[PDB]
């Protein structure tokens, strides 16, 4: 039953597939990368 507790702050990135997404965290949650895995809000 887990959920992606991503930030509210807008981050409209260019993606990796060539597509626009709401925030970078949302793309990672959905199943797409941005080559930015070294700097993300994910911190369990």
Curated annotation (Swiss-Prot):
Annotated PROSITE patterns = KAZAL_1, KAZAL_2
SMART domains associated with the record = KAZAL
Recorded GO molecular functions are: serine-type endopeptidase inhibitor activity
Disulfide links within the chain: 4-29, 6-25, 14-40
Q: At which residues is there a site annotated Reactive bond (tryptase)?
A: 8-9
Keyword Transmembrane helix recorded: no
Query: InterPro entries, alphabetically?
Result: Kazal_dom, Kazal_dom_sf, Serpin
Q: What domain of life does the UniProt record list for this protein's source?
A: Eukaryota
Q: Does the keyword Disulfide bond apply?
A: yes
Q: Which residues belong to any copy of the Kazal-like domain? A: 1-42
Q: Which UniProt keywords apply?
A: Disulfide bond, Protease inhibitor, Serine protease inhibitor
Which N-terminal stretch is annotated as signal sequence? Answer: none
Q: What does this protein do?
A: Acts as an inhibitor of human tryptase, trypsin and chymotrypsin. Probably acts to block host defense mechanisms.
The protein's name is Leech-derived tryptase inhibitor C
Which lineage ranks, top first, belong to the organism behind this chain? Eukaryota, Metazoa, Spiralia, Lophotrochozoa, Annelida
């Amino acid at each position: 039953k887990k959920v992606c507790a991503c930030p509210k702050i807008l981050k409209p990135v260019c993606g990796s597939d060539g597509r626009t997404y709401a925030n970078s965290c949302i793309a990672r949650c959905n199943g797409v990368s941005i080559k930015s895995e070294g700097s993300c809000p994910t911190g369990i």
